[PDB]
Please model this.
Amino acid sequence: AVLHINALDQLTALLSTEKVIVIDFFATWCGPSRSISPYFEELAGQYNNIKFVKVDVDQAEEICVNYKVRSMPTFVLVKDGIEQKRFSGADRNALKQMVETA
Amino acid sequence: AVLHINALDQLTALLSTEKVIVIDFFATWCGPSRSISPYFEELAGQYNNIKFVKVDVDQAEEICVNYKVRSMPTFVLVKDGIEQKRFSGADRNALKQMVETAHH
Model:
């Protein structure tokens, strides 16, 4: 399943204990394009070896501060505790690539 | 119960005529907009002394510009012709406060 985290220490602890995490900083509103959240959930169900985490930017101020989130959605790939890659935008291709190469 | 308005001069005339208005900027292609749309419409029945309006962002560019709406759903409270409050996102509780605290 998709994880739902809003507390920094819980995210930080996840990053310690799992190997590959893809974070989706999302909002309960859309901008220029439809939500990619169904595709994120679909990818979560295909790559059980990766932890897929959704972080509601309107509920996780501390994480958004720490991670320097400026726009939504922002997707961050983290391996072995360290950030590998991030992009912003509701872009199915970019998300697939990130997951593919995780 | 819920007025649908995509022209700027039409909205502005409404807002120059009615005392209290809550506007819902929506996109049918936006999941969270769909989710709360039902509740907005429910609330529109419930509170009869507030004019409830939907503006489709795909049909309402000039309105989206004057209002600086770039996200949906965005709800805006206008009272006595002045914008009082706004918020974006499908948060049913925020919408209730707004509707309740119209200061009526």
